[PDB]
Amino acid sequence: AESHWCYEVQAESSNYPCLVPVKWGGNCQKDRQSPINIVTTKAKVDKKLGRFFFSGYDKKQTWTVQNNGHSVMMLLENKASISGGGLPAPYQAKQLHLHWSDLPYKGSEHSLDGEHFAMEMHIVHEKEKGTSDPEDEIAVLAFLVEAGTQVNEGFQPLVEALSNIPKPEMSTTMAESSLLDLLPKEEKLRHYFRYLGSLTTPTCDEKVVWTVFREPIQLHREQILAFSQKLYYDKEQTVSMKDNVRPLQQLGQRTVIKS
């Protein structure tokens, strides 16, 4: 590759050359990529997709959050884990990060019936393997964020932290908060979509079991705008961080299922 990967917005907003998504190397040009559009009525119900069990999601922690130049990322350090959800094993939580724009009708990586949401939050987990790498080594939990006028109090520790990490490779410590503070009510997480795909940044490894929850997180417009207002892609602060979103990939021969 002849330069570092970037999102489209970065190449459009700066004169410094970088590799846009359609030009990404690694496995990014293979045929089981993510994100995708999900046609909700065409996803077949699979009875074996039961409720998720969250561990360590309720416990208050002071999380480390950092700007890695592509997004903001909470380091979960195996301090939380998941099971159920039609998953073959329990999975350990590694990180939480987001993708967003500054318009209410875009910012999500996945789309539901052709609608993008204002943001998409990803909680990345790793498989507890046995003896006997796989297509489902990583489980990413995806939550869509809808913009409105409801102040989401649970997001406030994260939103306030953002001022402190404007430039890449900066780290800060969030005020006391839980993962559940960031999510819809647990009982509303029974309905989700499931498919097999890839990581959405290079090298786009095809090792992800995806879950996209039907229920949106409600965040105030100004809490969403805090992300593009407070963060930058570069140490020079010439390009505000937003549209950190990979364009949609074809489902191809794959199947999307739902609980």
Ligand SMILES: CC1(C)O[C@@H]2[C@@H](CO[C@@]3(COS(N)(=O)=O)OC(C)(C)O[C@@H]23)O1
């Ligand atoms: C903050 C951001 C965007 O997310 C981090 C890191 C590199 O890319 C990721 C993307 O994970 S994803 N979007 O497929 O859930 O892939 C890994 C390596 C799992 O870490 C993710 O930058």
Ligand SMILES: [Zn+2]
């Ligand atoms: Zn992501």
